[PDB]
Amino acid sequence: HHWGYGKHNGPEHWHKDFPIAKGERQSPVDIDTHTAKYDPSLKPLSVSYDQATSLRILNNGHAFNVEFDDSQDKAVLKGGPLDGTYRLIQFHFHWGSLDGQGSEHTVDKKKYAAELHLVHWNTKYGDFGKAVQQPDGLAVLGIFLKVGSAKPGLQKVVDVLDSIKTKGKSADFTNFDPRGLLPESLDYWTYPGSLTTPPLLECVTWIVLKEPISVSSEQVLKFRKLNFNGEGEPEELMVDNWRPAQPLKNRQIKASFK
Numbered sequence: 001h002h003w004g005y006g007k008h009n010g011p012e013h014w015h016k017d018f019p020i021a022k023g024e025r026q027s028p029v030d031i032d033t034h035t036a037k038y039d040p041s042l043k044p045l046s047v048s049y050d051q052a053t054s055l056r057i058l059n060n061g062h063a064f065n066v067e068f069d070d071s072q073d074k075a076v077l078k079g080g081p082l083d084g085t086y087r088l089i090q091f092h093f094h095w096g097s098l099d100g101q102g103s104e105h106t107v108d109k110k111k112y113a114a115e116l117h118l119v120h121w122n123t124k125y126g127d128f129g130k131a132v133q134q135p136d137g138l139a140v141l142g143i144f145l146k147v148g149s150a151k152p153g154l155q156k157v158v159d160v161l162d163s164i165k166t167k168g169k170s171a172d173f174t175n176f177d178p179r180g181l182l183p184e185s186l187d188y189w190t191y192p193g194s195l196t197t198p199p200l201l202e203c204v205t206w207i208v209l210k211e212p213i214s215v216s217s218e219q220v221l222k223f224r225k226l227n228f229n230g231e232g233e234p235e236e237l238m239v240d241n242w243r244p245a246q247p248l249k250n251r252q253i254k255a256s257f258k
């Protein structure tokens with residue numbers, strides 16, 4: 001029926017409705033740190049989130065998205081391997097049922113507890129919908145989360161989850177600062193890829209940060225209390241909403257560091 005992460009509608013079934021699932025630049029991928037090419041020409045990343053405007057948080061049935069006002073250049077990403085300005089439209093997470101899994105990208109086969117995706121679209125294309133029709137239409141910042149100390153800047157998100165337990169529910173979520181989720185260093189790996197959930201469009205320039213942020217056991221625990229299902233339906237815990245690593249094929253992963 002509709003895609004999901006269960007045994008009957010999970011990642012291994014996606015190709016039937018979305019043939020691109022077996023494409024040439026699918027994500028996520030395993031990052032082999034020993035064959036990644038240090039590219040000294042890669043410029044530093046420029047994250048300008050000081051004027052970001054969060055608007056709402058929403059349980060969409062596969063994750064929860066925090067949406068931002070992208071009608072103007074308020075929170076943008078540029079620099080790095082990018083040409084042009086990309087606007088932040090939303091961020092979400094992928095997590096596991098256990099601390100030993102949850103991330104989509106892996107480093108030398110290592111899986112993290114979760115992975116944060118900050119989705120941006122290339123402004124030269126006018127809107128998000130037009131951006132998804134271009135090979136350089138999107139830029140996604142991937143940040144790994146490991147279990148340890150609590151992340152202060154993440155608590156506001158955790159506290160509001162109670163209000164959006166089921167699919168379709170949303171809540172106002174203004175004045176949230178995404179800078180509170182960034183690690184200290186901006187060193188990264190980058191390769192050409194795709195969205196990790198259907199439609200799985202190959203329009204993404206992935207920028208995966210080398211340094212993960214840490215969150216407490218109690219913080220990721222609240223993520224696991226969300227439901228894939230809508231209100232009044234049989235409860236299905238929202239856990240393991242991640243896609244397995246895909247073949248790298250004819251692609252080179254470049255590192256901004258050495």
Ligand SMILES: [Hg+2]
Pocket residue numbers: 131132133134135136137201202203204
């Ligand atoms: Hg595309």
Ligand SMILES: [Zn+2]
Pocket residue numbers: 092093094117196
């Ligand atoms: Zn994602």
